Each structure stands twice: as structure tokens, then as C-alpha cells.
Ligand binder design. Structure first.
Ligand SMILES: [Ca+2]
Ligand SMILES: [Ca+2]
Lengths: 217, 219
């Protein structure tokens, strides 16, 4: 009753010392040569498993693999550690998962030699086809914003309308007889100035300014 | 002690028999360890990547062989059924022969093509590994049908000499004082479609190439 996980699918296997080729076959791949297989080790590193190479699986537990349909791999580093990757890009969210950091309270950053390090938001893609080895790191989010003239430190990069309102009025979401407006400026390039209504979100940056009003409905 | 290794055909001295990949890159002169991909070329012919933290056991004698690519990516190909990683977007026919450990002169390099006939890769042509799938390469004995003095000959080399051609027509032929063997050819490949050969020259062959060999007076 043995399973492994491949790209987050559970996959049943009946060999505890399968080769890479045997794993690609169980995974439903037609042409195994066209795939690159990695085992995701307990320390968080990815080890490539060539078709002729064996891995050893415990009788209990679920080893984890990544399988890419790719004729090449790209390298990057993540908090100093070297990774190979079977796709030309990956998202900030996938980098967080590889880093094993607190997902919501960190950002992903790409080292840049000639400009400031680049913030990679969760859904943005890091282009590994750029010519050097991309150097990525996670860092705890701590963002200083002004809400109704008061300094607020926020540990999340993207927050909601009601999140903003609550930075100005502690007990405001339940106030069915109140209408709250939200304006902002000095935001980042993805939202520099504007207004927010319920259902919207905003990406924060240091020094961003918010003005929140409460009126009777 | 007096230990040497070979990195991309440069012989370099090392003072450690179990270096890490980083230490190998550092004696090779690299400033930025992360930007290179390091392979050891094993005795079984395979390229084994060495990560910066991994050690390699070297013998006190002999010169182990490493390839060191300045590359942020690796391409895969197969060669006679074995998997290769490669730190550059192309490699030549000649480099494939070297990796294959085949006899250079009696083999051709072929690229598998799923629909067309397989492609012949000459010694100086580049195989583009940036094409979308895993390139499948193999070496095979050369076999070319030529005509020498109206007899079909199968030759197992792509390049042959004046005396090879003469001796395909007449085994006894040799250098004389009174006569010489003339060689004229036609229906050759692009490098040499038609002409004459004298001692010292070579020609590239192709199927159907025709040679005419005659013993003439030295006039
Ligand atoms: Ca890159
Ligand atoms: Ca390719």
C-alpha cells in the first residue's frame, strides 16, 4: 500500500527501490527521455534522478517528486541554495513553497546587479531564461504605511479594503449603518494612487498613504 | 602531492585528492562559483555533474578529466542510448565522436528525426540543442557506395586519399620512374564535386561518386 507524490498528485507504486525510469512510467509518461525527474528531499533540496538511478523509499510515508516535461534545466539559487528547474519560469508563490517560509508574511526578491532587488509578488513569474543564474531570496515583510496620518506597520504585501479600513477604525466591518471610503497615494507602480471599495485589494509599499472616511448610511 | 587534473583541456595542479566542486572551480580560476556547471568525465564515458558542495575522490596518479561550462542552464541529449547533460546550446559532430569514444575516421554522427530520415552531422557542423525536445544522437559505421573504374566499391570512411583510390582500382600500383597513376572523379559532394587527384590529396566521398584511374606515361 505504497504511494508517492508527483507534482502534487498521489501516485500508487509497488516498488520501494524504483529507478527514475520506473517512476516516470508509473507517472503516466509516454517518452521518459523527454522528462526531468527530481526528488524533493527533507532538507528542501531537489535531487535529480536519472532514469538509471535508484531511489530508496520507506515502507511508510510519501516521498515527493517534481516531474517536468523539458529538454533542459535552468538554475537558480534560493536563500543561497542551488536549485535546478525544468521550466523557463516559476512564480513567487512556488518560490515560497520551495523556501518553506511563512507564506503570507514573506516576500520573494530577485537580486539585481544594476538596479534595486526586484520584488516578485506571488503570481508574478521569474524569467530563468535571462542569461545568468537568478539569485532569489525570501525576506520577512514589514511595510511602513500611513493611515489617517498614523504610522502602521504591515506584515503582508497585499491587503484588502476592510484590512485598510480596520487600520483606521478598529470595529468597522460590522457597522452596517456606516459607509467607509478609502483613498490612497504614493503606492507602487502596480497601484500608485486611487480608491478602494469592498472586494478590492492593494499592494503596499513603504510610505504609501491612505485616507479613510466613515459616514452614516 | 604532485597531483594534476584536466579542466576543459587545461592541465591544472591541485593539492587535494578529495576536493569539492567549488574548490575545483576555484583552482580553475572562477570568480563566481554559482555561474558554472562542472562535470567529471568518468571512465565509463558519462558526464557526472559535481555540485559545489560535493567532493570527488581523485587518485594520487593519473589526470582526471572535467568539463567546466559558464552556463546558467543545461541541455539534455542522448548518445547511443545514454543520457548526457551539456552546458552549452550546441556541440559539434567531432565533439560527439569524442564523447562516444568511437573510431573517429570510420564513423558518422547521426541525429534521429521522427518523421524524416535521420540527419548526418559532419565533424564541424553544430547540433542545436535549443531545439525543443531531447536530441537523440548515435554513431554508426560509415558505409558509402562509390564507383571505381566501373566497379562498385563499399567504403567505410568518408574521406580517402589519392593512394586509397588508386589502390581500389589496382592493388599492385606503386610509385614508378616511368609512369604515374591519374585519378579523375565526378559526382562528388559539395566539398569536391569533380576534378582530379594527385598524391597528397584527399576527397570527401558520397554515394554514387565515380573515379577513373589510369596508369599513364610520365611524359
Ligand atoms: Ca538564468
Ligand atoms: Ca533540445
Amino acid at each position: 500500500n505504497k504511494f508517492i507524490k508527483i507534482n502534487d498528485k498521489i501516485v500508487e507504486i509497488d516498488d520501494l527501490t524504483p529507478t527514475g525510469a520506473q517512476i516516470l512510467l508509473v507517472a503516466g509518461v509516454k517518452d521518459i527521455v523527454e522528462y526531468v525527474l527530481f526528488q524533493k528531499l527533507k532538507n528542501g533540496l531537489l535531487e535529480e534522478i536519472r532514469p538509471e538511478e535508484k531511489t530508496t523509499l520507506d515502507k511508510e510515508g510519501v516521498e515527493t517528486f517534481l516531474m517536468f516535461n523539458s529538454d533542459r534545466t535552468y538554475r537558480f539559487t534560493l536563500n543561497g541554495k542551488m536549485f535546478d528547474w525544468g521550466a523557463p519560469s516559476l512564480t513567487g508563490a512556488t518560490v515560497k513553497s520551495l523556501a518553506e517560509c511563512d507564506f503570507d508574511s514573506n516576500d520573494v526578491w530577485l537580486e539585481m546587479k544594476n538596479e534595486k532587488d526586484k520584488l516578485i509578488t506571488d503570481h508574478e513569474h521569474i524569467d530563468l531564461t535571462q542569461p545568468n543564474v537568478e539569485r532569489l531570496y525570501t525576506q520577512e515583510t514589514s511595510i511602513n504605511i500611513i493611515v489617517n496620518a498614523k504610522m502602521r506597520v504591515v506584515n503582508r504585501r497585499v491587503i484588502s479594503y476592510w484590512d485598510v479600513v480596520h487600520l483606521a477604525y478598529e470595529h468597522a466591518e460590522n457597522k452596517e449603518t456606516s459607509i467607509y471610503s478609502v483613498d490612497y497615494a504614493k503606492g507602487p507602480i502596480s497601484n500608485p494612487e486611487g480608491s478602494m471599495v469592498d472586494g478590492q485589494y492593494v499592494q503596499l509599499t513603504d510610505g504609501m498613504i491612505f485616507y479613510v472616511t466613515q459616514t452614516d448610511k
